[PDB]
Amino acid sequence: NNKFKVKPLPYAYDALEPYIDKETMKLHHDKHYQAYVDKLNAALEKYPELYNYSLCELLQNLDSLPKDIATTVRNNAGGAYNHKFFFDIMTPEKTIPSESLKEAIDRDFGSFEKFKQEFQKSALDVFGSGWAWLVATKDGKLSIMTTPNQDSPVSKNLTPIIGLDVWEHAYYLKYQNRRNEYIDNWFNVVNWNGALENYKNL
């Protein structure tokens, strides 16, 4: 069996309280993330060799996949990848920026605080469903960008370092329309050690 799988949450469903509620963690992981994986798997039944691609490879080749599944793959491989990534980029442990990522953030944004303000503004300005990302080019240059729906920076050959889901399902139970508060609180659970790994894997 080489079907795609849901990665078990890397911590307890309530580990991120009080910043993100346990009910949302359960829905977000067990329902939304699960649905993306199931839908992806269903679509690939027609082309079982695609089960041997990684999610990255699917996302890097959307324009060359068979026309009849390309959009479904974009959306569902997108959702699967983005959510695996998102749950991995948060943690109940306390972390801070360090090593090359810490330096790069200062280099590219002037300071951690300037980076944080830009990120929060971008997250806040996403219209409709989508994501805010800290991304790196192949040479380690950092920038902030957003994607709609489940589109991913990976498809534009950019490497996600951190990313924030701003689909309303990610925050409505606790914050309702107050996305600004959700964004501000989320920085308490960003896994900067994971982010460093992401940046190093360039």
Where do contacts with a copy of itself occur on this chain (CB under 8 A)? 27, 31-32, 35, 75, 127-130, 148-150, 167-169, 172-173, 176-177
Q: Which of residues 175-194 bind Fe ion (CB under 5 A)?
A: none
177 touches, from Fe ion, a copy of itself, none (C-beta below 5 to 8 Å by class): a copy of itself
Q: Is 32 annotated as a binding residue?
A: no
Contact (CB, 8 A) for 193 and 96? no
Contact (CB, 8 A) for 51 and 154? no
- 175 vs 192 by CB, closer to a copy of itself: 175
CB of 135 to a copy of itself, least distance (A): 21
- 130 vs 160 by CB, closer to a copy of itself: 130
First-last CA distance in the chain: 30
CB of 76 to Fe ion, least distance (A): 13
Contact (CB, 8 A) for 191 and 89? yes
d(C-alpha 31, C-alpha 25), whole Å = 10
Q: Is 106 annotated as a binding residue?
A: no
Q: Tell me which of 165, 186, 191, 198 binds Fe ion, using CB under 5 A.
A: 165
CB of 23 to a copy of itself, least distance (A): 8
| Nearest-10 Cα torsion for 194, 196, 200, 202 | 80
Contact call for residue 167 and Fe ion (CB under 5 A): yes
Q: Is 29 annotated as a binding residue?
A: no
Q: Is 28 annotated as a binding residue?
A: yes
- 8 vs 128 by CB, closer to a copy of itself: 128
154 is written with which tokens? 């990976």
Contact (CB, 8 A) for 132 and 37? no
- 32 vs 102 by CB, closer to a copy of itself: 32
165 touches, from a copy of itself, Fe ion, none (C-beta below 5 to 8 Å by class): Fe ion
Q: Which CA distances in Å does 202 have to 138, 139, 150?
A: 6, 8, 23
What number of chain residues touch Fe ion (CB under 5 A)? 3
| Burial class of residue 61, CB neighbours in 10 A (0-12, 13-18, 19+) | middle
3-class DSSP assignment, residue 163: strand
d(C-alpha 147, C-alpha 129), whole Å = 9
Q: Which residues are annotated as a binding site for Fe(3+)?
A: 28, 83, 165, 169
Q: Which residues are annotated as a binding site?
A: 28, 83, 165, 169
